[PDB]
C-alpha cells in the first residue's frame, strides 16, 4: 500500500484498509494546502518513510522510456514507482512482473475527441447525480500491496509492468480510461493534458487521443476519424511585429518566450465565497470590483477569461464596434 | 421577556465614529441561534449579554 | 417528486461544461437535489428526491442554474442559493429608446465603457451584478438595488454621459440609507 | 367544500401570475381558465402605492391565495408567468418571481412553468417618443 | 479570613445577574483589606475588570476636580457609608452594593448611526463591563448631586443613593436616569 500524493489531496483515509503504508518525503512535504498539513498532525502515525534503490529507479526509468511516458514522469513519481517495485520484489516473488511491454493497437472511430462521454452529469438520450452518488463519482471504480495514484501516467506504467493498483475505493481497479495529447507532426505522446506545446518539436500541435488500458497490460488508443479535427482553417494569419517593453503582449508562439509581468491586484482577483460563516454580515452581497488600480486601466485579464475568443479564427469578421483586447 | 446571550465571535467595528462593535451572539436557551448584533462598549470573545428584546435583528446586508 | 428543466444556448455549452462540478456540488450537497444535463434536449434538469431537506430549494436551484446560464458567474448565483431577497430583472436595450443599427451598438459601448470600467462602476454603487447579452441587460441584486441599476442603465442609453450617471447614482446611493 | 377526490390524486389549477410595472396579479383559475377561484393584487395587501409592486406585496398575495386554495382543496397548481408584454417590456419582473417562490414555499406543488406573455409578432408604435422612456 | 477593613465578610455575597457575575469580582480571590491598592489596572485592555469593585467605587467618586487626588479620604468616606448602610438595612454592605450596581446598569443605549445631520439614533446592546462602569458612575453622580448644599453628608448621601438604587425605588438618581435612558432606547428603534 504505497500512498501517492493524490490520495493525500483527496483526504483518502485508507489507513485502516492497508497495513504496509510507505511514503516519500517529497510526495508529502510539497503540498501547499493548509487542510492537508492540518490533518497530517491529527492523523494516526503508522505511515513510515522508505527510500528506493538506484538500481530499481534505473530499471523503472529504463522501461518507462520504452512505454513512451518518460517526459510525463517526475522524479518523486519515479520514487513512488520504484518504491512499490522494491516492496513487491522483496515481499512477493519477482516472476509476476513483465518487462518490455506490449505494442499498441490502433482502432479509430467517427466520434469527436470533444464528445462529452464519461462525464457523470451528462446523459445522451437514466444518469442522475444523487447525494448517494456524490461520494461515488471519483473515476472508473472497479490483495496486500498497491498504489494510491490518481495520475493516469502512474496507473499506465504500473499496469503495463503488471502491478495490481487501486484507488480511493478499497477494491483494486481493472481498466484505465483517459485521454492523452499526441503531436500530429512528430507523433510523440504526452500524458500531461494541461500543456499545449509538445516537448519534441515545440509546435502548437497536440491533439486529444483516447486511451484505454486493460488489466492484462494491453493498451488500445482511439483516434478520431473526423475531418474537423485535422483542419488547417484558422492557422495561417498575418502576425504583428514583435513589440518590447513592460506593456507588450505577444501572440504566444513558443512555450517559453519571456512575457512581461502583467499581474492583477489582490482586489481584482478576489472571488466571492458564499458559504463563509461571516458572509451574511457583508454590506454588499458581492466582492467589490477593482477599478482604481493601474492593472484595471491596462485591461489586464486572467488567463482563464477569454477562451472561446482565442478559438475563433483571426481570418473572420467580428462585430463592427467590438475590439478583441 | 428577557433572554440571556453569549459571545461567539467578535466581527468588527461599526458606527459613525467606530463606537459600536458588530458581534455574533449565541443563545443560552439551549438553541443554536447565532444572530449578529451590535453592541456598545468593550466586548471580548466569551462575554455574556442581557437582551431586552430578541426579535429584532441588527444590520445584516 | 417534481422537477424543473431549463434550456442552454449553444454559446453557453462550454462554460457549463467547464464549471460543471462547481454547479452541481452545492446543488447535491447543501440542497440535496438530483441533477442531470439532457444532451438530446440540451436541458439542465433538476428534480427533488426523498432526502430533500425542505420545499422551495428546487426553485433556489433553478434560479442558480438559470442565472449561471444567463451569463452570471457561478459565485454570483451561489449568492442566489444562499440569500433570499435576490431577483433578476432583464430588459432589451431597444425597449426604452428606439435605436437602429450602429447607434444601438454605441449604447452597448456606454454600458461597458472603456475596459468595462463603467459597468464595474455601477457594480460598485448599486451592489449588483450585471450581464450584457447582445441586445439584453440582466441585473441581479436586491429590489431597490435592481431599480437603482435599471435607472442608471436607462440613463446611460438615453444619451447621458457617464459622469452624470456616476454623480446621480452616487447621490441616490447616498439617500438610500446604505 | 371542494372536489370529492381521494388523498392520492391531486387537482390542478392555473395560476396567472401577471407582474406589471405597477403591481402584481394572482389569478388562480380552473384548468379551463374561464372561471376564477382567486386573484390577489398588490394593492389589496399594502396600503401604499409606492409599495404596490414590491416583492413583499407579491409574497403576501401568494400566501393569501394559497390559503384560499387550501380552504377549497386545490393542492397543485400550474404556473403561467406573465409580463405586461406587447409594445412594453416582455420579461416578467421580480414580483412574479417573488410570488412564485412564496407560493412554492407554502406547501404547494408546482406543475408546469409557462412563460406566456403577449409577445407581438410585429409591435405597434412604442409608448414613448423618439426621445425615449423611463427617465 | 480576609475581611473588608477587617470587619466585612465577602463569602455571603451572591450575584443575581449572570451577565455581571464575571466582571463584579469581589467574591473569593479579589477580596482585599483596603480598597486602596495603587496597582495598575489601565495598563492594558480589560485589566480593570480584575480590580475589586470597591476600589472601582473608590476611584469613581473622587473624580470631581477639587478632590482629584485624595484616596485615603475616599476610602474613609466609603467606610462611613458602609457603616451606616449596615446600621440602616442590617444586611452586608457588599450585598446591597452588588444589588445597586446590578439594578442601576443600563441594558440598551441609543447611538448615533449614519452621518452628521441625521440625529436619528439606533438602539444597540450594552457591554457588561461598560454596564458596570456606567452603574458605578451613575451612583457616584447621584452621590455628588445629593450632597451639594445641605447638612446631609456625602457618605450618608452615597449610602442613601445606594439603598435607593438597590431596592429599585424611583428615588435614586441612577434609577431615574437608567429608566429614562431605557425608555428613550425603546422609543428610538
Ligand atoms: Zn511535435
UniProtKB/Swiss-Prot annotation, chain B:
It comes from the Eukaryota. GO terms for biological process: cytoplasmic translation; maturation of SSU-rRNA; ribosomal small subunit assembly; ribosomal small subunit biogenesis; ribosome biogenesis; rRNA processing; translation. The modification Phosphoserine is found at residue 34. GO terms for cellular component: cytoplasm; cytoplasmic side of rough endoplasmic reticulum membrane; cytosol; cytosolic small ribosomal subunit; extracellular exosome; nucleolus; nucleoplasm; ribosome. It is found in: Cytoplasm, Cytosol; Cytoplasm; Rough endoplasmic reticulum; Nucleus, Nucleolus. CDD domains: S1_S28E (cd04457). Keywords: Acetylation, Cytoplasm, Diamond-Blackfan anemia, Endoplasmic reticulum, Nucleus, Phosphoprotein, Ribonucleoprotein, Ribosomal protein. GO terms for molecular function: RNA binding; structural constituent of ribosome. SUPFAM superfamilies: Nucleic acid-binding proteins. Coiled coil: none annotated. Belongs to the eukaryotic ribosomal protein eS28 family. PANTHER family: 40S RIBOSOMAL PROTEIN S28, SMALL RIBOSOMAL SUBUNIT PROTEIN ES28. Component of the 40S small ribosomal subunit. Part of the small subunit (SSU) processome, composed of more than 70 proteins and the RNA chaperone small nucleolar RNA (snoRNA) U3. This is Small ribosomal subunit protein eS28. The gene is RPS28.
UniProtKB/Swiss-Prot annotation, chain C:
One of its GO terms (molecular function) is RNA binding. Keywords: Acetylation, Nucleus, RNA-binding. One of its GO terms (cellular component) is nucleolus. It comes from the Eukaryota. It is found in: Nucleus, Nucleolus. The keyword S-adenosyl-L-methionine does not apply. Residues 101-153 form the KH domain. One of its GO terms (biological process) is ribosomal small subunit biogenesis. Expressed in liver, lung, spleen and kidney. Weakly expressed in thymus, testis and ovary. Weakly or not expressed in heart, brain, skeletal muscle, placenta, pancreas, prostate, small intestine, colon and peripheral blood leukocytes. Belongs to the PNO1 family. Part of the small subunit (SSU) processome, composed of more than 70 proteins and the RNA chaperone small nucleolar RNA (snoRNA) U3. This is RNA-binding protein PNO1. It comes from Homo sapiens (Human). The gene is PNO1.
Curated annotation (Swiss-Prot), chain D:
Component of the small ribosomal subunit. Part of the small subunit (SSU) processome, composed of more than 70 proteins and the RNA chaperone small nucleolar RNA (snoRNA) U3. Its main location: cytoplasm. There is a cross-link at residues 45, 47, 90 (Glycyl lysine isopeptide (Lys-Gly) (interchain with G-Cter in SUMO2)). Keywords: Cytoplasm, Isopeptide bond, Nucleus, Phosphoprotein, Ribonucleoprotein, Ribosomal protein, Ubl conjugation. Belongs to the universal ribosomal protein uS11 family. This is Small ribosomal subunit protein uS11. The modification Phosphoserine is found at residue 123. Residues 115-135 are annotated as: Disordered. Component of the small ribosomal subunit. The ribosome is a large ribonucleoprotein complex responsible for the synthesis of proteins in the cell. Part of the small subunit (SSU) processome, first precursor of the small eukaryotic ribosomal subunit. During the assembly of the SSU processome in the nucleolus, many ribosome biogenesis factors, an RNA chaperone and ribosomal proteins associate with the nascent pre-rRNA and work in concert to generate RNA folding, modifications, rearrangements and cleavage as well as targeted degradation of pre-ribosomal RNA by the RNA exosome. One of its GO terms (biological process) is erythrocyte differentiation. One of its GO terms (cellular component) is small-subunit processome. It is found in: Cytoplasm; Nucleus, Nucleolus. The lineage of its organism: Eukaryota, Metazoa, Chordata, Craniata, Vertebrata. The modification Phosphothreonine is found at residue 117. PANTHER family: 40S RIBOSOMAL PROTEIN S14/30S RIBOSOMAL PROTEIN S11. It comes from the Eukaryota. The gene is RPS14. Residues 126-135 have a biased composition (Basic residues).
From Swiss-Prot, chain E:
Keywords: Acetylation, Cytoplasm, Isopeptide bond, Nucleus, Phosphoprotein, Ribonucleoprotein, Ribosomal protein, Ubl conjugation. PROSITE patterns: RIBOSOMAL_S7 (PS00052). The modification N6-acetyllysine is found at residue 32. It is found in: Cytoplasm; Nucleus, Nucleolus. Pfam families: Ribosomal_S7. GO terms for biological process: cytoplasmic translation; regulation of translational fidelity; ribosomal small subunit assembly; ribosomal small subunit biogenesis; translation; translational initiation. There is a cross-link at residue 32 (Glycyl lysine isopeptide (Lys-Gly) (interchain with G-Cter in SUMO2)). It comes from the Eukaryota. GO terms for molecular function: mRNA binding; RNA binding; rRNA binding; structural constituent of ribosome. InterPro entries: Ribosomal_uS7 (IPR000235), Ribosomal_uS7_CS (IPR020606), Ribosomal_uS7_dom (IPR023798), Ribosomal_uS7_dom_sf (IPR036823), Ribosomal_uS7_euk/arc (IPR005716). One of its GO terms (cellular component) is cytosolic ribosome. Component of the small ribosomal subunit. The ribosome is a large ribonucleoprotein complex responsible for the synthesis of proteins in the cell. Part of the small subunit (SSU) processome, first precursor of the small eukaryotic ribosomal subunit. During the assembly of the SSU processome in the nucleolus, many ribosome biogenesis factors, an RNA chaperone and ribosomal proteins associate with the nascent pre-rRNA and work in concert to generate RNA folding, modifications, rearrangements and cleavage as well as targeted degradation of pre-ribosomal RNA by the RNA exosome. NCBIfam families: PRK04027.1, uS7_euk_arch. It comes from Homo sapiens. The gene is RPS5.
Amino acid at each position: 500500500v504505497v500512498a501517492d500524493a493524490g490520495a493525500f489531496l483527496r483526504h483518502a483515509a485508507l489507513q485502516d484498509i492497508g497495513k504496509n503504508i510507505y511514503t516519500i518525503r517529497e510526495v508529502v512535504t510539497e503540498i501547499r494546502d493548509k487542510a492537508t498539513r492540518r490533518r497530517l498532525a491529527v492523523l494516526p502515525y503508522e505511515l513510515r518513510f522508505k527510500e528506493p534503490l538506484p538500481e530499481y529507479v534505473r530499471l523503472v526509468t529504463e522501461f518507462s522510456k520504452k512505454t513512451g511516458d518518460y517526459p510525463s514522469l517526475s522524479a518523486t513519481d519515479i520514487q513512488v514507482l520504484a518504491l512499490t517495485y522494491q516492496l513487491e520484489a522483496e515481499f512477493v516473488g519477482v516472476s509476476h512482473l513483465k518487462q518490455e511491454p506490449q505494442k499498441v493497437k490502433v482502432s479509430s472511430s467517427i466520434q469527436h475527441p470533444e464528445t462529452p462521454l464519461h462525464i457523470s452529469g451528462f446523459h445522451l438520450p437514466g444518469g442522475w447525480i444523487t447525494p448517494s452518488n456524490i461520494k461515488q463519482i471519483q473515476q472508473e471504480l472497479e490483495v496486500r500491496v498497491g498504489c494510491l495514484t490518481t495520475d493516469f501516467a502512474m496507473q499506465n506504467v504500473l499496469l503495463q509492468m503488471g502491478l495490481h493498483v487501486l484507488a480511493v475505493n478499497g477494491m483494486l481497479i481493472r481498466e484505465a480510461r483517459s485521454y492523452i495529447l499526441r503531436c500530429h507532426g512528430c507523433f510523440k505522446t504526452t500524458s500531461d493534458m494541461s500543456r499545449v506545446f509538445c516537448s519534441h518539436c515545440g509546435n502548437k500541435t497536440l491533439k486529444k487521443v483516447s486511451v484505454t488500458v486493460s488489466d492484462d497490460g494491453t493498451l488500445h488508443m482511439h483516434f478520431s476519424r473526423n475531418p474537423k479535427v485535422l483542419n488547417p482553417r484558422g492557422l495561417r494569419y498575418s502576425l504583428p511585429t514583435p513589440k518590447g517593453g513592460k506593456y507588450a503582449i505577444n501572440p504566444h508562439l513558443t512555450e517559453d518566450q519571456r512575457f512581461p509581468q502583467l499581474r492583477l491586484s489582490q482586489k481584482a482577483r478576489q472571488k466571492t465565497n458564499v458559504f463563509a460563516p461571516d458572509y451574511i454580515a457583508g454590506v454588499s452581497p458581492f466582492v467589490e470590483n477593482d477599478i482604481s488600480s493601474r492593472s484595471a486601466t491596462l485591461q489586464v485579464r486572467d488567463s482563464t477569461l477569454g477562451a472561446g475568443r482565442r478559438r475563433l479564427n483571426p481570418n473572420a469578421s467580428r462585430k463592427k464596434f467590438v475590439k478583441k483586447r | 421577556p428577557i433572554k440571556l446571550a453569549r459571545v461567539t465571535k467578535v466581527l468588527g467595528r461599526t458606527g459613525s465614529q467606530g463606537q459600536c462593535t458588530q458581534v455574533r451572539v449565541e443563545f443560552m436557551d439551549d438553541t443554536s441561534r447565532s444572530i449578529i448584533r451590535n453592541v456598545k462598549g468593550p466586548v471580548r470573545e466569551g462575554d455574556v449579554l442581557t437582551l431586552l428584546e430578541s426579535e429584532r435583528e441588527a444590520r445584516r446586508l | 417528486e417534481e422537477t424543473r428543466k431549463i434550456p442552454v444556448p449553444a454559446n453557453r455549452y462550454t462554460p457549463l461544461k467547464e464549471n460543471w462540478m462547481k454547479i452541481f456540488t452545492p446543488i447535491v450537497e447543501h440542497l440535496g437535489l438530483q441533477i442531470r444535463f439532457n444532451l438530446k434536449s440540451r436541458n439542465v434538469e433538476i428534480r427533488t428526491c426523498k432526502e430533500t431537506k425542505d420545499v422551495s430549494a428546487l426553485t433556489k436551484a433553478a434560479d442558480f442554474v438559470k442565472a449561471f446560464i444567463l451569463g452570471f458567474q457561478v459565485e454570483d448565483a451561489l449568492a442566489l442559493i444562499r440569500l433570499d431577497d435576490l431577483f433578476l430583472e432583464s430588459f432589451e436595450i431597444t425597449d426604452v429608446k428606439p435605436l437602429k443599427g450602429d447607434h444601438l451598438s454605441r449604447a452597448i459601448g456606454r454600458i461597458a465603457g472603456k475596459g468595462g470600467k463603467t459597468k464595474f462602476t455601477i457594480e460598485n454603487v448599486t451592489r449588483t451584478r450585471i450581464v450584457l447579452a447582445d441586445v439584453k441587460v440582466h441585473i441581479l441584486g436586491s429590489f431597490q438595488n435592481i431599480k437603482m441599476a435599471r435607472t442608471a442603465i436607462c440613463n446611460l442609453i438615453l444619451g447621458n454621459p457617464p459622469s452624470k450617471v456616476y454623480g446621480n447614482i452616487r447621490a441616490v446611493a447616498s439617500r438610500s440609507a446604505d | 367544500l371542494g372536489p370529492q377526490v381521494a388523498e392520492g390524486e391531486n387537482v390542478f389549477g392555473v395560476c396567472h401570475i401577471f407582474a406589471s410595472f405597477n403591481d402584481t396579479f394572482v389569478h388562480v383559475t380552473d384548468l379551463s381558465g374561464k372561471e376564477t377561484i382567486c386573484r390577489v393584487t398588490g394593492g389589496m395587501k399594502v396600503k401604499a402605492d409606492r409599495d404596490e409592486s414590491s416583492p413583499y406585496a407579491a409574497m403576501l398575495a401568494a400566501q393569501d391565495v394559497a390559503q384560499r386554495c387550501k380552504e377549497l382543496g386545490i393542492t397543485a397548481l400550474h404556473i403561467k408567468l406573465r409580463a405586461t408584454g406587447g409594445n412594453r417590456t416582455k420579461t416578467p419582473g421580480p414580483g412574479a418571481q417573488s410570488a412564485l417562490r412564496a407560493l412554492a414555499r407554502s406547501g404547494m406543488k408546482i406543475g408546469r412553468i409557462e412563460d406566456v406573455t403577449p409577445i407581438p409578432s410585429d409591435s405597434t408604435r412604442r409608448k414613448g417618443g423618439r426621445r425615449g422612456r423611463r427617465l | 479570613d480576609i475581611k473588608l477593613f477587617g470587619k466585612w465578610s465577602t463569602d455571603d455575597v451572591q450575584i443575581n445577574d449572570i451577565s455581571l457575575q464575571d466582571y463584579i469580582a469581589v467574591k473569593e480571590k479579589y477580596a482585599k483589606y483596603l480598597p486602596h491598592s495603587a496597582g495598575r489596572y489601565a495598563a492594558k485592555r480589560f485589566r480593570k475588570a480584575q480590580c475589586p469593585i470597591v476600589e472601582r467605587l473608590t476611584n469613581s467618586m473622587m473624580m470631581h476636580g477639587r478632590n482629584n487626588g485624595k484616596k485615603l479620604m475616599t476610602v474613609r468616606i466609603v467606610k462611613h457609608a458602609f457603616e451606616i448602610i449596615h446600621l440602616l438595612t442590617g444586611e452586608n454592605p457588599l450585598q446591597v452594593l452588588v444589588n445597586a450596581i446590578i439594578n442601576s446598569g443600563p441594558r440598551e443605549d441609543s447611538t448615533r448611526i449614519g452621518r452628521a445631520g441625521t440625529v436619528r439614533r439606533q438602539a444597540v446592546d450594552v457591554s457588561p463591563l461598560r454596564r458596570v462602569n456606567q452603574a458605578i458612575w451613575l451612583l457616584c453622580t447621584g452621590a455628588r448631586e445629593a450632597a451639594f448644599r445641605n447638612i446631609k453628608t456625602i457618605a450618608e448621601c452615597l449610602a442613601d443613593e445606594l439603598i435607593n438604587a438597590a431596592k429599585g425605588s424611583s428615588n435614586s438618581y441612577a434609577i431615574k436616569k437608567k429608566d429614562e435612558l431605557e425608555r428613550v432606547a425603546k422609543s428610538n428603534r
